[PDB]
Amino acid sequence: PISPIETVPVKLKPGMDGPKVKQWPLTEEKIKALVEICTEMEKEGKISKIGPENPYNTPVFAIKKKDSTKWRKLVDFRELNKRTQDFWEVQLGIPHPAGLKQKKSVTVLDVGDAYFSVPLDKDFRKYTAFTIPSINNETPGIRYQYNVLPMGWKGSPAIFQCSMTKILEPFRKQNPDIVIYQYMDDLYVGSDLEIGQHRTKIEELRQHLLRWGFTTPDKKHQKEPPFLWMGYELHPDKWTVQPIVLPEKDSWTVNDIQKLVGKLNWASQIYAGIKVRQLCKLLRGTKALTEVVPLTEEAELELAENREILKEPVHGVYYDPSKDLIAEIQKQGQGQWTYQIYQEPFKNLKTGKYARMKGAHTNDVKQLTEAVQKIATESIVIWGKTPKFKLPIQKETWEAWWTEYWQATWIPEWEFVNTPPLVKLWYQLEKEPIIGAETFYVDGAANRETKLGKAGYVTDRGRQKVVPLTDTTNQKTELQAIHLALQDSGLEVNIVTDSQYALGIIQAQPDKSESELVSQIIEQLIKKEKVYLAWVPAHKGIGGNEQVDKLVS
Amino acid sequence: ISPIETVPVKLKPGMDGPKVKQWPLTEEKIKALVEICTEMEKEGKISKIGPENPYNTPVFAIKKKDSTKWRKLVDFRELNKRTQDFWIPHPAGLKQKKSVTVLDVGDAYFSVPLDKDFRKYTAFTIPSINNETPGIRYQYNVLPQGWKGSPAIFQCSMTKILEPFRKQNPDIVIYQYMDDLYVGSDLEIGQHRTKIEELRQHLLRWGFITPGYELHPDKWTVQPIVLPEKDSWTVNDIQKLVGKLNWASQIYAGIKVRQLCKLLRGTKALTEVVPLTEEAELELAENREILKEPVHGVYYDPSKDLIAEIQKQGQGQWTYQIYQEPFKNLKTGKYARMKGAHTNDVKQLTEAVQKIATESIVIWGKTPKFKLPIQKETWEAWWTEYWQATWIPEWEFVNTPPLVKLWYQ
């Protein structure tokens, strides 16, 4: 049926006209298949025949269903979508099963026949024109247009979700206690109500949807646990991610790949390590949805590892507002962080991994800070509140960090959990010069034309040094010069530099770095007992800074 | 009500409307905004819209000082930036008043309708917990709060309601910025509060306010560049002084470090005490007299933007400078610590930004563009939790561990 809901006004992009893409030729089998399909959705009012005055056209294909003899009417709206106005994505994300409160009565309704039930703006309908071609190229083709939201058109998801929401609106007011989640095909309805009283409310909703042109098949109607909902299996006490099976095809088409990527993108939110880069690279340079795409070596290996990842079972419990939210973080290798969000011990709501691979120089303290923020933000999205944190860092460690850190930083309510590897400041620069310690006056320079340079030091104990450097820069030689001072010295040192760059990155006190140079400097600082780093304005007649600058330049 | 003519409002040439995403909100704030928006919808102030509106502007909830009622705040910074310019001289006398009270007259804007062709640009979204429902979308039908077009369009109506009070009190300065009203006088504090009460009652009578915060510009002190005072100067202490004087020479003239650099001869140890020569004591002394007062000849350009840099000095102290061109400060200052934020840097930073912006409003009638010494993710996560103003200034994030830290304290 077709909903009596008010259409949503749609326009093309400013200065753009409708699509005029020529229809490709088709087999007599495919053509006659499309004629049978179009005939059915013509008498159901989903499409209408149009006159020869309509200049617009969008290509259509005829593909068979997966393991079925039935034909599908596929339309390539890529040209119309480019010319269609932008819509605002209202949702801030996907509903998480752990965001659901436990309900005594649960029903998941199938509203799959929903796209072809929402009317399209009458002014826009002409731009969705398509042609069923003729084999003889002499008989004119049958031309239709959509009266309803087309599958694959840019505005279909947004306008549908908007339509559904407005239709569900009065039912939710009449039933503020009943929880309703909508997401395309699946319609979740939960209540702490007796079955008979609940099932009656279900029929009330279905009749409400039916009057608004939305049918709910009793075949896909789910009555008893477990309930399938958005790729999740809902049990009364727990929820389980249903096994995600990836297709196995000899010949992949463009349509197949993008559907795979879309599916893998959804799974990447639940599973860690899901990659789609090598599959997306296959798509670049394609012209048709039916175009066959050969999997490269990197692509088929990427798909293979994705399969192994999706084999891991994922499950969790439901949310209980009466208990507090607890979030615990622990440090792992390669700057990776894992976390669990629970309320009762060993009853996780959400489990995930955070891989921090953005930046050159950092420490475990800053990485933990950013992890807390990411978790706090997620919790607000799902539960509307921030959790109490359990962090593997001493209260003294953190206090020594934020009080000396030039930059403003802060962490919410948190208690310490003693479980290695703990987050620790591996070193700390002195606030005052070290007495009795050798004073290294450090400088370095480099030729911008030849990438050649020198680096060295002069000390108050008469010790001097200068080392030739190749393939370096003005910034690299300044770090190498400090690195030299750390190398040829005791466990306590004063280092004077004129480099604002070199000074800056050591003030942040990093414990890990992409640079082999910085990493070695970090290793040196850890082995040292006391290190004071001082800055001096270059070229102003400062003693030690003078002798070392002339020796390097 | 009879339809009154809306003034035609357009965007700047070549500019499209605001397309900014809504950030997550807590359950408490969502419920508060829902209740507020339902009321505004019933009163015709806002209308529900669909996805065919490609524009969006962030919304959130704050609580003003000396109040417990939830206040709806919309971040129109992107829209304001793209909105046409509307063409009030800033009252210079406002800065020289003993007491300036801040009144919120934001509700007055909801009396004037907004141009129908412009309403689409005021779209905003109330998010839902766990995305149970797609966010509730609204747009404005009347003049929105936080939009720079509102005080401009409503200016004529604002001058009429203040005309009786401004004649009865010719020595009382009233300035308007966005939703806030600044009322300043040299009157005694006891008699002052009775005058602002007389004004707010006059505003309550005509629906400018719907059923405290005092400022004292004379107490706003300048933070000068100070030089250390020691009897024993190490080589390190000399180097620090040279570095501070070298930087300060970019702002002030006649600053020299020749006599001080002579003390740094040979290859000295950092902890070595070096006796100051009589000419080094002289050079230092005359440098102090230069840094005693602010630099002359630094004029405020009404066309150019104001810039504010902030430094964290620790112990709850924060320094800040306001300029339009580098090393030409219009104002410098330092804020002492305050109880309640003893362990919260972000809370201290947010309060500092509001104070600086407030002072900038009183002095120049404009908020400065802030360079915040904080990570973007850290600030954007909790800054709303401590915001109490109805306006929001521009800001960016800087990450340079400075020597400029002790170059101001």
DSSP letters for A38-94: HHHHHHTTSEEE--TT---BB-EEEEE-TTSS-EEEEE-THHHHHHBPP------SP
Among the residues of B262-344, which ranges form H helices? 278-290
Distance between CA atoms of residues B183 and B170, nearest Å? 12
- Nearest-Cα distance to chain A for B316, in Å, is 10
Strands A414-416 and A388-391, by their bridges, are parallel
**Within chain A, what is the greatest distance between any pair of CA atoms?**
101
Contact present, B57 and B118 (Cβ < 8 Å): no
Residue A55 in contact with partner chain B when CB distance is under 8 A:
no
The tokens of A552 are what?
Answer: 């390097």
Give CATH for domain B93-117+159-214: 3.30.70.270
- Strand ranges, E, within B300-362: 307-314, 317-323, 329-335
Cis omega before residue A412 (within 30°)? Answer: no
The tokens of B238 are what?
Answer: 């000399």
Q: How was this structure determined?
A: X-ray
The class of domain B8-92+118-158 in CATH terms is alpha beta
Strands A186-191 and A105-110, by their bridges, are antiparallel
Residue B378 in contact with partner chain A when CB distance is under 8 A:
yes
Helix, strand, or coil here: A414? strand
Pick from A108, A112, A111, A98: which is nearest to A191 by CA? A108
List A residues 142-161 in contact with B (Cβ-Cβ < 8 A): 155, 158-159, 161
Residue A489 in contact with partner chain B when CB distance is under 8 A:
no
- Which residue type does A533 have? L
Q: Which helix (H) or strand (E) holds B99?
A: strand B99-104
Asked whether the beta carbons of residue B132 and residue A158 sit closer than 8 angstroms, the reply is no
Distance between CA atoms of residues B311 and B374, nearest Å? 10
Nearest by CB to A90, which of B135, B239, B345?
A: B135
Residue B260 in contact with partner chain A when CB distance is under 8 A:
no
Contact present, A21 and A56 (Cβ < 8 Å): no
User: Please, is A197 exposed, middle or buried when counting C-beta atoms within 10 Å of its C-beta (0-12, 13-18, 19+)?
Assistant: exposed
Distance between CA atoms of residues A232 and A250, nearest Å? 29
Pick from B235, B115, B409, B246: which is nearest to A539 by CA? B246
Asked whether the beta carbons of residue B378 and residue A409 sit closer than 8 angstroms, the reply is yes
Q: Which residues of B touch A158 (CB under 8 A)?
A: 51
Q: Which helix (H) or strand (E) holds A190?
A: strand A186-191
Other Cβ atoms less than 10 A from the Cβ of A290: the count is: 16
Strands A492-497 and A530-535, by their bridges, are parallel
Pick from B171, B8, B12: which is nearest to B85 by CA? B12
Pick from A206, A192, A202: which is nearest to A223 by CA? A202
Asked whether the beta carbons of residue A504 and residue B400 sit closer than 8 angstroms, the reply is yes
Q: Which residues of B touch A93 (CB under 8 A)?
A: 131
Distance between CA atoms of residues A457 and A371, nearest Å? 40
Pick from A439, A380, A386: which is nearest to A411 by CA? A386
Distance between CA atoms of residues B369 and A221, nearest Å? 58
The residue count for chain A: 553
Residue B232 in contact with partner chain A when CB distance is under 8 A:
no
Superfamily of domain A91-115+157-225: Reverse transcriptase/Diguanylate cyclase domain (3.30.70.270)
- Nearest-Cα distance to chain A for B217, in Å, is 27
Pick from A370, A368, A377: which is nearest to A350 by CA? A377
Distance between CA atoms of residues A357 and A522, nearest Å? 19
Distance between CA atoms of residues B270 and A497, nearest Å? 12
Q: Which residues of B touch A381 (CB under 8 A)?
A: 24, 130-131
Q: Resolution in A for the shown PDB structure?
A: 2.6
The tokens of A526 are what?
Answer: 């850890």
A229-232 — which CB contacts under 8 Å span 24+ positions? A229/A97, A229/A108, A229/A181, A229/A186, A229/A188, A230/A94, A230/A95, A230/A97, A230/A183, A230/A186, A231/A266, A232/A97
Residue A535 in contact with partner chain B when CB distance is under 8 A:
yes
Q: Write phi, then psi, for B51 (nearest 5 degrees).
A: -75, -10
The tokens of A152 are what?
Answer: 């694959």
Pick from B155, B151, B137: which is nearest to B54 by CA? B137
Nearest by CB to B52, which of A8, A386, A507?
A: A8
Distance between CA atoms of residues A118 and A136, nearest Å? 36
Look-up: residue for tokens 């319609």? A187
State the Rg of chain A over Cα: 33
Nearest by CB to B374, which of A408, A437, A542?
A: A408
Q: Which helix (H) or strand (E) holds A354?
A: strand A348-355
Breaks (C-N over 2.5 A) in chain B follow: 87, 211
Give CATH for domain B301-407: 3.30.70.270
Give CATH for domain A226-319: 3.30.70.270
- Which residue type does A520 have? Q
Helix, strand, or coil here: A160? helix
Contact present, B315 and B391 (Cβ < 8 Å): no
Domain B215-300 matching CATH 3.60.110.10: the answer reads no
> Directed axis angle between helix A474-487 and helix A516-527, to 10°?
30
Superfamily of domain A320-426: Reverse transcriptase/Diguanylate cyclase domain (3.30.70.270)
Nearest by CB to B54, which of A87, A406, A462?
A: A87
The class of domain A1-90+116-156 in CATH terms is alpha beta
- Nearest-Cα distance to chain A for B27, in Å, is 5
Asked whether the beta carbons of residue A494 and residue B271 sit closer than 8 angstroms, the reply is yes
Other Cβ atoms less than 10 A from the Cβ of A463: the count is: 13
- Nearest-Cα distance to chain A for B351, in Å, is 13
Domain with CATH 3.30.70.270 in chain B: 93-117+159-214, 215-300, 301-407
Distance between CA atoms of residues A478 and A518, nearest Å? 11
Contact present, A104 and A191 (Cβ < 8 Å): yes
C-alpha distances (whole Å) from B34 to each of A380, B41, B72, B107, B136 are 17, 10, 10, 18, 9
Select the residue from B27, B49, B52, B346 to test the A interface by mutation, using most A Cβ atoms within 10 A.
B52
Classify residue B304 by its DSSP letter.
S
Q: Which residue of B has its CA nearest to A156?
A: B51
List B residues 143-202 in contact with A (Cβ-Cβ < 8 A): none
**B183-199 CB burial, b ≥16 within 10 A, e <16:** bbbebeeeebeebbeeb
Domain-by-domain residue ranges, chain A?
1-90+116-156, 91-115+157-225, 226-319, 320-426, 427-552
C-alpha distances (whole Å) from B160 to each of B86, B112, B156, B176 are 19, 15, 7, 13
Residue A8 in contact with partner chain B when CB distance is under 8 A:
yes
Task: Say whether A226-319 and A91-115+157-225 share the same fold.
Answer: yes
Q: Which residues of A touch B400 (CB under 8 A)?
A: 504
Asked whether the beta carbons of residue A408 and residue B346 sit closer than 8 angstroms, the reply is yes
Half-sphere exposure of B76 (CA within 13 A, CB side): 24
Contact present, A480 and A453 (Cβ < 8 Å): no
Distance between CA atoms of residues A268 and A490, nearest Å? 50
Pick from A384, A550, A357: which is nearest to A466 by CA? A550
**A450-460 CB burial, b ≥16 within 10 A, e <16:** eeebbbbbbbb
Distance between CA atoms of residues B157 and A500, nearest Å? 55
- Select A427-552's CATH number: 3.90.1150.10, 3.40.50.10490, 3.30.420.10, 3.40.50.970: 3.30.420.10
Q: Which residues are within 8 A (CB) of B253 and not within 5 positions of it... i.e. 6 or more apart?
A: B290
Distance between CA atoms of residues A161 and B67, nearest Å? 39
The tokens of B310 are what?
Answer: 């902030």
Vertex A493 angle, CA A526 and A409, to 5°? 55
Residue B239 in contact with partner chain A when CB distance is under 8 A:
yes
